[PDB]
Amino acid sequence: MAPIQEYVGTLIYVGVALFIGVAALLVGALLGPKKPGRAKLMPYESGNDPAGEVKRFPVHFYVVAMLFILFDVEVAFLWPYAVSAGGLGLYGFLGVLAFTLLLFVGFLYEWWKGVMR
Amino acid sequence: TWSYPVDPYWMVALKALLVVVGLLTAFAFMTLIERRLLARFQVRMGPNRVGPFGLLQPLADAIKSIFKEDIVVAQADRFLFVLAPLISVVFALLAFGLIPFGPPGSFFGYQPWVINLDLGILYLFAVSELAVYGIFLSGWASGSKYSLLGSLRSSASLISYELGLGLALLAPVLLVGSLNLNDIVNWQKEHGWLFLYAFPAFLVYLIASMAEAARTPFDLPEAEQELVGGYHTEYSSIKWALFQMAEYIHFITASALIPTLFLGGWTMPVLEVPYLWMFLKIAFFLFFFIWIRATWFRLRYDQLLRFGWGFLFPLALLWFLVTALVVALDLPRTYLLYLSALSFLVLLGAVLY
Amino acid sequence: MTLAILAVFSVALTLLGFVLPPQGVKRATLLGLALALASLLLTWGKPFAFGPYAVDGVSQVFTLLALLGALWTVGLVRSGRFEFYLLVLYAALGMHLLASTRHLLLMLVALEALSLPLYALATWRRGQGLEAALKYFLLGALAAAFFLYGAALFYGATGSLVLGAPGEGPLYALALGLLLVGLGFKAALAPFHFWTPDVYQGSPTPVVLFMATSVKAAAFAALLRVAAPPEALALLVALSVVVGNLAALAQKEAKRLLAYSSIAHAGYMALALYTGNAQALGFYLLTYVLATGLAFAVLSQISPDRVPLEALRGLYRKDPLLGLAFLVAMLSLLGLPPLAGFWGKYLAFAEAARAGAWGVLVLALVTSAVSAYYYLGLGLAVFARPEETPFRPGPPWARAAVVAAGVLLLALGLLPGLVLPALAAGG
Amino acid sequence: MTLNVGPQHPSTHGVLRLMVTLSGEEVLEVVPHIGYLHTGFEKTMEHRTYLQNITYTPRMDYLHSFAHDLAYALAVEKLLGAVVPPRAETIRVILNELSRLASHLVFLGTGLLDLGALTPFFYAFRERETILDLFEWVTGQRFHHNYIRIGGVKEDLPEEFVPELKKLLEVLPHRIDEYE
Amino acid sequence: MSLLEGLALFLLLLSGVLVVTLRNAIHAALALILNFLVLAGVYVALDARFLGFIQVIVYAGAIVVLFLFVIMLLFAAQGEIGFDPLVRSRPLAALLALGVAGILAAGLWGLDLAFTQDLKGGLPQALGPLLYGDWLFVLLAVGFLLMAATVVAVALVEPG
Amino acid sequence: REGILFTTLEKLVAWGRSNSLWPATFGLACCAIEMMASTDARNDLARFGSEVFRASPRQADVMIVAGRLSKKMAPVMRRVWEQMPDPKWVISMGACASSGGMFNNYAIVQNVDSVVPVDVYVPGCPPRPEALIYAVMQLQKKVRGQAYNERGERLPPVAAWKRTRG
Amino acid sequence: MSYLLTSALLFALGVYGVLTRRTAILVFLSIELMLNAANLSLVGFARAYGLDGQVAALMVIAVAAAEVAVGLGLIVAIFRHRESTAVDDLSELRG
Ligand code: SF4
């Protein structure tokens, strides 16, 4: 085990940080002049409309996102190995290499094919 | 924490409260000195009126920010729009205060870290991912499709480097064999400084901390002179300040971690006095980034992906495997020493023609 | 060792495919499979555990079949993009692993290894072929989810993730069922059949070949290791055999006809599962794979895109050999001695009666007589007038293949007493 | 897709509006739209004196003012057939190329600034200030010189302009190399 | 335990309700993030710490970002697009849904076990020997699965 | 509230606004580059307000209309102005802005002041950088409540909590 | 016992999800909740029968993650040239 106390201590901390956050925002929010909407409906640039209509966006963003998940799964697995690594011995290392090369093959496919397409 | 004391919940709260508001005040006077240090670099004088020495200007500035209209767009859905800065600041604040600063009891009889967990590194890595929520959501929240395009650019970049940060950080975790920061500090106290012993993992970590907006990505997008900046450009009042605030708290957090991990933040064979020496390492990195901040250009996003993804991760994973070999057979540590030293010679020689 | 060739090949080819033009990857992958088949043969009947991976008698029979099916499908394809060979390879590996494990977490991972490349192989981009893909995937992810949930409740009830742990009262009873859902769906035992008519129709023919033999084999492979209650089975079989044969009268398009049929066939195989014998079920699947394999090959040679009932007519005029091949195939699936198809049935039925389970066995037999309706609906249609419909002849390669297949069918029909000795449990 | 990179938003360093038809991320074509600053010189000068007109030519190119002026100066001078003494021709080149330095200096200042971070702007400007101050002495203004009239410059150089011009000629080589 | 415990499990269920109810996609997904956080807490609470941190890192940080990027790329201006002849299907959906809780409830009710066996907080220390031990094949299987996932995923989207 | 209750508070806030004036430039014509000048090096504006040149009009405040204002540009500008948060001032720099400059044409607009209301005029062409500092010094003392006309009467801090966006 | 009951409830909710939703992306979203219902169960029993159910869970997560990737990839690839993202209106396969 290890102290559950210190995980609690995180929760406390989160409660403090969130509080000071919200506190600042609520001061700011409540004070200020106002003139009701009738033209603050509009956003940046050229009056209304910031730039035309864009309807669709490239696959670029999908690809980048997708990479990150699969390789994040990699990292997840490589943490246990990082910790105990004199106990797992030489056989350990071979386990690691096998796994690594497999995800690296993944990599080489997406690299030789591209991250702008 | 199996060797370090726990503090009762109240005392935790007190430290937490101090460090949070500490980072507000931190951010305040940091903006001023950075502002001014840019000025000097560009052969000018920074703010220095608004008595006595420019040191009340952030007060004035801050007071200005409140007492302003709460612009809430028609075209924004309310809930996300108001929420969106909040999330980004919360998850940025969190996990500065993890980092140790001095040996036990040296805060009037209490611990200089707020928490200490039992898994340090994961917690850091985890909080770094949650910043990216804030970013793209804000984009969407405002509901301008221009803003949206900005935020995805931003997030895309972040998320790419974010993974690389992981494979960089494995290398010292090998050597100490534990996760918590403290173990890492104390290990270096004896054995000596992880920037010696795993130099290419130092490097990629540094250049990954660039990606926390440090300048030298910087087709972040920005808004000025470019395709619109993500998040901001639709925020106005206090909320806008919050976004910027977050970006700086990241900056100093990274500027602290690179000392904590890689240099031993309270390690020092000269004298260890608890807090003092930490602030001097902070100061150094602070200044390093501002020299960057001034003197170089930016990377055009296309270029930026090629650089992190394609180049940076192969140097990181090549190093992970090598060190993993060395650490696995539990050989003398000399063999990394030789390698670090050699890699430095490569990376030094590279600047020399 | 069979695993050894596949895994190695899979990785190696991944990168290789950049250097070679698309044909070289077809030549390569075709070869790979053939080597993997070789490696099986020379170690026949000798078992190798390594813990997780576990070579048994069973594995050997069912992956023999699976690789066969996979060779055929890679054969015919000509289309670009190195992946449309590559993926079939992958999927095969996935099935190899699937059969060769008992340990549930591996079994799940294996299920994904085979199911993933299948979803993508469902697209030559024909509009239907996206719909198909989609249905299969969404329904698939649900059955997946059950199989994962099942495993999690199993771990509760025994204290193991190996199959063959003891068992007890309600949770173990429940748990044992929820594993049947996932595995069940992949081989399509009604009611889980639903995707099998749409997906077979929508998907382009050669792909469907791979699916209709091999995936069914592999899925069944894993099903056998489950201890499936005699009660669960009685439900499954009945619904499969009923819905299969009855519903099939209604259809008039080749792919869908064979689809509903393959719900019925899943039902018939599932009889063997009562006692469970991979001598009986082994035999069955051999006759089923060959016959379906033959039959679906012919359907590719017509068009790679859905054909109505009429198109099959006149096959004898255009080519005599093919006309006979496809004929023999159709009778073999009806079950009609002295083609092997009867023997495949007979062995299964015998295991049902041996364990004693009568009502079910009767339904099965009755409705197999029903089956003759739509099967003659194809099988004779061959001799009638040709109409205007495509029929590109296809390679000399394949002509030889198809006729080989049809000879392997009728050969075991007269001579079943060759193979049965060595498809045994210990071999 | 259709991006409207606006008029003076966030900048362009003009007030140009561009209809950028984008396919994916590689720009097809940009259709420029101008008309956000036509303030009509051509019309107005049709209603002013020739002397007055020299105060209308440098309100066009801001940065390189003296070049417009000079170009006009010749055109009329030619027309009515005046000459222009030798010293004049000297003064006109010294200022003209000095103004060219003004234009390039501001150009490289903006260029680096534009994309690229902040710093090189300030250096490029600093040198420009020194040029403007030299100019200030002789024409009385930082820019929008009124120091050429039809036939030559309107008054002799002040005494102080030649020594100080020498000062800046020392520095510029070293500085130019440091921009490079 | 039931004092504090009650609240946290309540939150879990509540969060669950929201992600299948709410009629705007983003609000849904965002709720689901709150779900998986709570769940991460519940992992930590059950003497399984490492799994907790991986829950946040992978499931709430990786997976859901992928979800969100998809829901932005193509819009999702209503989370219930279609008023459709299947509008009848709402009460039948609620009916079967209840059924699946009932049957599962049966299987799980009256269960007797032990809760004594100490994982040791499930810290990565104690996970190392198993993971690269008896499960090492399974790991490599996982790894192959990922590689296949990459190859497939690319080939689906970009016609390669 | 609105910043104005206790004498004390409002004097605070008024200092707050006044010394923090972040300039948003609206470069336009020939003036503009001399307006950019006001930052670099020899002179300054980074020690009154700030160096920054706000990256949207949304998050800005003192709009410096610096240059010629073509008639076609007027409705755009009208809208750029409208979207500023509520305390907003317009310094109108240069003759060209202030009174249409010399051009009397159909094209140019005589006095930017028709459209957006001006608070400080700063005459000149280009008013040399030090003059621009002087303008902002004015506007500083304007917002403190210490601004007069020649007739002897004070003016309220803004002159644009007056006509606003309706 | 409380937690393990809760997991079954969370499963129930997920089913309600899959049947109700009328957007493709939100179907898939619901599936992901079900997969976590599972992973919780798996840990819950892991306290009883010790240690292997941890490793179990980790592998499970990974499978889920993999299945996310391909599935969302597909959902995108199907509807990247129309935007009526209802999960019906695939009626064209039926005979
Ligand atoms: S006032 Fe003078 S410097 Fe300014 S825009 Fe006009 S002509 Fe140019």
Residue numbers in the entry:
A (entry chain A): 1 to 117
B (entry chain H): 2 to 354
C (entry chain N): 1 to 427
D (entry chain 4): 26 to 205
E (entry chain J): 1 to 160
F (entry chain 6): 16 to 181
G (entry chain K): 1 to 95
Paper lines:
Cryo-EM analysis of complex I incubated in the presence of either NADH or NAD+ in the solution (before plunge-freezing) yielded two 3D classes differing in the overall conformation, the so-called major state (~60% of particles) and a minor state (~40% of particles). The conformation of each class and the distribution of contributing particles in each dataset did not depend on the presence of NAD+ or NADH. Cryo-EM density for bound NADH was clearly observed in maps from NADH data and a weak density for the adenosine part of nucleotide was observed in NAD+ major state. Major states are at a higher resolution (~4.2−4.3 Å) due to the larger total amount of particles than in minor states (at ~6.0 Å resolution). Both conformers of the major class (CXIMJ:NADH and CXIMJ:NAD+ states) show almost identical RMSD of 2.00 and 2.19 Å when superposed on the CXIINT crystal structure. In our conditions, the NADH cryo-EM sample should have been fully reduced, however, the density for the key β1–β2 loop in Nqo4 is not sufficiently resolved in the major classes, so we could not confirm whether H384 flips, as would be expected, in this case. The distribution of particles indicates that major state is energetically more favourable than minor, and this does not change upon complex I reduction by NADH. Structures of CXIINT and CXIMJ states were very similar at both global and local levels, differing mainly in a slight rotation of PA in the CXIMJ state. With the exception of this rotation, both structures share a high degree of structural conservation, which suggests that in practice both of them represent the same conformational state of CXI.
